[PDB]
């Protein structure tokens, strides 16, 4: 271990605002939907969507990040980035897809191909994969005037409520699906969604953890 | 649109046997054949059995002969039964419909 | 599983009628893009192999006569022959083909008097 030293020397504080220290498109959700059967049935066809719920206490290496606050405000700048795979041709297709965006309140699809997917009133977005990959920007939608973090009650008014949920907190779920509907046997097409929480404003700074995690619903060590 | 087989077979418990189902008057490696719901897809296609036939029945298939047979070992008294194929129906991947049927078996 | 029930348990009529007969199912069997109900109905005359009548719980089959039309909505289905006659004695099948493994109807044998 070689012990070095230089002198420092640096001026100006523009590196530590709250806007420059809380952004960078971390990634999210990664999760790839694959076809091995040459034959499939008439119900395994209708599940080859996805949905995730965009609370963003999913990676801890954010997660840790986003609470040293307790209030937030921002909005979203989702990024879809979509890849193609194999398992004698070798060549990738150029295929086209949807991404469909439920907020709250609005009914979620529960198949590849309903009439939730056709309704005018919600903002679907329809990319190839031949293009530069596909963004929408998302505003802020809760009801308060900030996000809590940090949640010190019940969801409802009753004895058997979850601790800690709170429910003007969600902002609502995505959905993607590929509309070519001829199921290609031997591929396999890997979503990868990035987002950018900009226009950041922050309240009450809190000290941060120190043991590791137990689950993504509570803060138990 | 014709389906010929085997005629008719029967024997003691403890031998395995073979059920071979003729197509013939349609074009092959477009069609699932099913059996009565175990499928093999006639295009170098292994398919899914049944659970509760999962190891009792195994099956293939034969291209040039355009035949699918399929094997059942460890035969008991309990398979007085009828087992023939169907010859399906594959559009885009999905399983179709139940079209036209065997002879008996 | 999906299991196919059915409820009038081999009805006897008489000839020149107009019948109908239930077919039970668990669930759902509404395929998305086809946007029809996935279903089959059967014909075996006694001493040989069934035949397909009716497809797609909505559709004839090409080769069968006009007398074969019934379709019903929801989980519970039916098939109508227009007239009854001497030669339609079977035991009339209803089959889902939506999610595997794929299970017969009951069995409702018809007889002729």
């Known amino acids: 271990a070689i012990q070095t030293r230089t002198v420092i020397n640096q001026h100006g504080v523009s590196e530590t605002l709250v806007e420059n220290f809380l952004s960078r498109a971390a990634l999210v959700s990664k999760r790839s939907f694959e076809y091995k059967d040459h034959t499939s049935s008439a119900a395994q066809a209708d599940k080859n969507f996805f949905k995730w719920t965009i609370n963003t206490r999913s990676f801890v290496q954010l997660r840790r990040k986003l609470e040293l606050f307790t209030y937030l405000r921002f909005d979203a700048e989702i990024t879809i980035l979509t890849t193609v795979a194999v398992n004698t041709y070798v060549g990738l297709p150029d295929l086209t897809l949807q991404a469909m965006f439920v907020p709250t309140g609005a009914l979620t699809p529960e198949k590849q191909d309903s009439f939730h997917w056709q309704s005018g009133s919600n903002a679907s977005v329809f990319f190839k994969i031949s293009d530069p990959p596909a963004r929408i920007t998302i505003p802020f939608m809760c009801i308060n005037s900030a996000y809590s973090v940090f949640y010190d009650g019940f969801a409802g008014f009753e004895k058997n409520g979850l601790y800690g949920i709170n429910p003007a907190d969600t902002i609502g779920n995505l959905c993607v699906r590929i509309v070519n509907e001829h199921q290609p046997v031997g591929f396999t097409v890997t979503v990868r969604v990035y987002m950018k929480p900009k226009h950041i404003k922050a309240w009450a700074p809190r000290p941060p953890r120190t043991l590791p995690y137990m689950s993504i619903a509570n803060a138990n060590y | 649109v014709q389906l010929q087989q085997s005629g008719a077979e029967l024997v003691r418990p403890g031998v395995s046997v073979k059920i071979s189902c003729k197509g013939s008057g349609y074009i092959f490696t477009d069609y699932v054949m099913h059996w009565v719901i175990g499928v093999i897809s006639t295009y170098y296609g292994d398919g899914s059995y049944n659970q509760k036939f999962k190891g009792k029945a195994t099956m293939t298939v034969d291209k040039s002969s355009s035949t699918a047979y399929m094997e059942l070992a460890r035969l008991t008294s309990e398979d007085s039964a009828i087992y023939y194929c169907?010859?399906?129906?594959?559009?885009?991947?999905?399983?179709?419909?139940?079209?036209?049927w065997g002879q008996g078996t | 599983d999906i299991v196919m029930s059915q409820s009038p348990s081999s009805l006897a009529v008489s000839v020149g009628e107009k019948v109908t007969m239930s077919c039970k199912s668990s669930?759902?069997?509404?395929?998305?893009?086809?946007?029809?109900?996935?279903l089959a109905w059967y014909q075996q005359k006694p001493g040989q192999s069934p035949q397909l009548l009716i497809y797609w719980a909505s559709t004839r089959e090409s080769g069968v006569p006009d007398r074969f039309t019934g379709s019903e909505s929801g989980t519970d289905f039916t098939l109508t022959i227009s007239s009854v006659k001497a030669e339609d004695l079977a035991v009339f099948y209803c089959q889902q083909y939506y999610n595997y493994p794929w299970t017969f109807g009951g069995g409702t044998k018809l007889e002729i008097k």
């Open positions: 169907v010859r399906g129906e594959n559009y885009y991947g999905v399983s179709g419909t139940m079209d036209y």
């Open positions: 669930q759902s069997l509404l395929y998305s893009n086809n946007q029809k109900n996935y």
